Structure 1
Amino acid sequence: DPFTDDLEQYLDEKILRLKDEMNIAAQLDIDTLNKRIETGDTSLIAMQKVKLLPKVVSVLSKANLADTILDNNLLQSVRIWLEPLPDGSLPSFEIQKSLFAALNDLPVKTEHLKESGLGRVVIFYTKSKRVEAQLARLAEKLIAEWTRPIIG
């Protein structure tokens, strides 16, 4: 039992470490894009999220990591990754699609949405004209499933 607790705490810490790296990557990219606007320097490219994406996708895809992911509010980092950027862009197609596909397979609950604010950005995806249609559809399907417990 202390054996089980130590082991669940090891998982927790690994997911919170990833959560920290995701936030750092997102903030670095925002800093980079701000410097771009302010400087004109076009050799400034914001790629920190793209570099970390494969690690993020691997974690979100492991069935036995779902509880740890949800318990530690990693979805809050996911929300931040989906948010519009300072130069008016959205994150890359690959980021959007990978995150929505992962969200579809995670057993996301109302409490997880309340704690993460994730529903607010996903609803933005059903409306934004910058979103490709097929991803707007994935976003709509997510919203419908998430609201079903309340509204049917």
Structure 2
Amino acid sequence: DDLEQYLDEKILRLKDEMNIAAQLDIDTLNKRIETGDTSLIAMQKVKLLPKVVSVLSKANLADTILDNNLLQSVRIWLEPLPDGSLPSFEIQKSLFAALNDLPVKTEHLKESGLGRVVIFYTKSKRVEAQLARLAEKLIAEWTRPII
């Protein structure tokens, strides 16, 4: 309960770091676009990805991850930009593999916005089939009646 506050703060700091990385990468992309300089490339998310995968993979962190809406930040990494473009394949595959192991429920999808993003992955022509089908399996599962 102070052990539980320490876990919360640790997940909340990752949540912030993920959002800062995503915003930095968007700034870089916009600059690469404005200037046409292809030596500018967004790297903040990929540098942070190993930590995100590590944390998301820890069984005893599931409750803290789910209770602190870390899936919101996961959703921000996955979500399409307004032109419809997606993060790299490596980010998609790493995040979806990590989500495959988390006990996600409808309430988390609603609160994080992840539900509508995972649905988008089931439909977008830009997504590799293996990930589109995994997205379709996960959404069915996460929203299942619960016998």
Q: Given the two structures, how large is their TM-score scaled by the length of structure 1?
A: 0.91
2:110 alignment counterpart: 114
Task: Supply the RMSD in Å over aligned alpha carbons.
Answer: 1.6
- CA shift, 1:8, in A, is 0.3
Aligned residues, how many?
147
In the alignment, does 2:100 pair up with 1:104? yes
Q: Secondary structure at the match of 2:80?
A: coil
Deviates more, 1:87-96 or 1:19-28: 87-96
- CA shift, 1:60, in A, is 0.3
The structure with the largest helix share of the pair is: 1
Q: Which runs of 5+ in 2 are unaligned?
A: none
What is the identity percentage for the equivalent residue pairs of Structure 1 and Structure 2? 100
Gap change, CA 1:88 and 1:47, over 3 Å in 2: farther
Q: Which runs of 5+ in 1 are unaligned?
A: none
Task: Tell me, in whole angstroms, the C-alpha distance in 2 between the residues paired with 1:39 and 1:67.
Answer: 44
Gap change, CA 1:25 and 1:86, over 3 Å in 2: farther
Contact 2:105/2:143 (CA < 8 Å) preserved in 1? no
Task: Tell me, in whole angstroms, the C-alpha distance in 1 between the residues paired with 2:22 and 2:105.
Answer: 25
Deviates more, 1:15-24 or 1:138-147: 138-147
Q: Given the two structures, how large is their TM-score scaled by the length of structure 2?
A: 0.94
Task: Tell me, in whole angstroms, the C-alpha distance in 2 between the residues paired with 1:71 and 1:88.
Answer: 30
Task: Tell me, in whole angstroms, the C-alpha distance in 2 between the residues paired with 1:31 and 1:88.
Answer: 17
Contact 1:57/1:99 (CA < 8 Å) preserved in 2? yes
- CA shift, 1:150, in A, is 8.3
- CA shift, 1:40, in A, is 1.1
Task: Tell me, in whole angstroms, the C-alpha distance in 1 between the residues paired with 2:98 and 2:110.
Answer: 18
CA deviation vs aligned residue, 1:18-60 (integer Å, no higher than 9, x gap): 0000000001111111111111121110111111000000000
Contact 1:37/1:87 (CA < 8 Å) preserved in 2? no
Contact 1:22/1:52 (CA < 8 Å) preserved in 2? yes
- Out of 84, 87, 106, the residue aligned to residue 91 of structure 1 is 87
Task: Tell me, in whole angstroms, the C-alpha distance in 2 between the residues paired with 1:27 and 1:86.
Answer: 15
Deviates more, 1:78-87 or 1:138-147: 78-87
Contact 1:19/1:74 (CA < 8 Å) preserved in 2? yes
